[PDB]
């Protein structure tokens, strides 16, 4: 199922994302990641090393260290270096955009959703379901410009 819900403060975050280099596409991805477009979920989303998640998109460390200028070349053991993305939105957005530009959208979705294993199996039903969910959210956000600044959240239960 899918739907809408009003989240106070959401329009502020939408506008900060869109004024920090993010596009409507970035907004759709982040809207699926968290309810509040925030970074205050549990540290690393409770995961460690290559599986740890950082930033408003919950990017994993494998992706960050393999495909972003800010962390390129870094090791699995260096995973705590990704925590800076939890309070630097500009670098967070740039990292995701760079990562998608390195891998391309299809493989970026696979690695974002399933890590390094996803890169070798990028068209599973689960990755496709995630891609279809982001696309649906994007199309709802694109359907009225009010959704770029109001407190409306579009959600999908992936």
Ligand X SMILES: OC[C@H]1O[C@@H](O[C@H]2[C@H](O)[C@H](O)[C@H](O[C@H]3[C@H](O)[C@H](O)[C@H](O)O[C@@H]3CO)O[C@@H]2CO)[C@@H](O)[C@@H](O)[C@@H]1O
Shortest Å, Cβ 94 to ligand X:
20
Shortest Å, Cβ 111 to ligand X:
13
CA–CA separation, 88 and 51 (whole Å): 20
CB atoms within 10 A of CB 155: 17
CA–CA separation, 125 and 111 (whole Å): 14
Residue 132 binds ligand X (CB under 6 A) = no
From 9, 12, 23, 35, residue interacting with ligand X (rule: CB under 6 A): 35
Task: Output the CA–CA distances (angstroms, integers) from residue 104 to 32, 43, 138, 156, in the order listed.
Answer: 20, 28, 18, 24
From 43, 49, 136, 155, residue interacting with ligand X (rule: CB under 6 A): 155
**Nearest CB to ligand X, comparing residues 5 and 144:** 5
CA–CA separation, 155 and 134 (whole Å): 9
Stretch that binds ligand X, among 28-36, 84-92, 94-102, 141-149 (CB under 6 A): 28-36
Between 49 and 78, how does the x/- string for binding to ligand X read (CB under 6 A)?
---------x--------------------
Stretch that binds ligand X, among 9-17, 26-34, 68-76, 140-148 (CB under 6 A): 26-34
CA–CA separation, 93 and 72 (whole Å): 16
The conformation of residue 7, written as its DSSP 8-state character, comes to -
Where on the chain is the footprint of ligand X (CB under 6 A)? Answer: 5, 32-35, 58, 155-158
């Amino acid at each position: 199922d899918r739907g809408t819900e009003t989240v106070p403060g959401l329009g502020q975050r939408k506008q900060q994302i869109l004024n920090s280099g993010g596009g409507v596409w970035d907004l759709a991805i982040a809207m699926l990641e968290t309810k509040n477009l925030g970074t205050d979920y549990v540290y690393g989303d409770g995961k460690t090393y290559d599986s740890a998640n950082f930033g408003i998109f919950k990017q994993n460390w494998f992706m960050l260290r393999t495909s972003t200028s800010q962390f390129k070349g870094q090791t699995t053991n260096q995973w705590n270096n990704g925590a800076v993305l939890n309070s630097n939105l500009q670098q967070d957005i740039k990292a995701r955009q760079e990562s998608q530009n390195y891998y391309g959208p299809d493989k970026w979705f696979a690695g974002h959703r399933n890590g390094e294993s996803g890169l070798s199996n990028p068209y599973t039903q689960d990755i496709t379901n995630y891609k279809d969910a982001v696309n649906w959210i994007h199309d709802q956000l694109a359907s009225d410009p009010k959704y770029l600044s109001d407190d409306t959240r579009f959600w999908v239960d992936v």
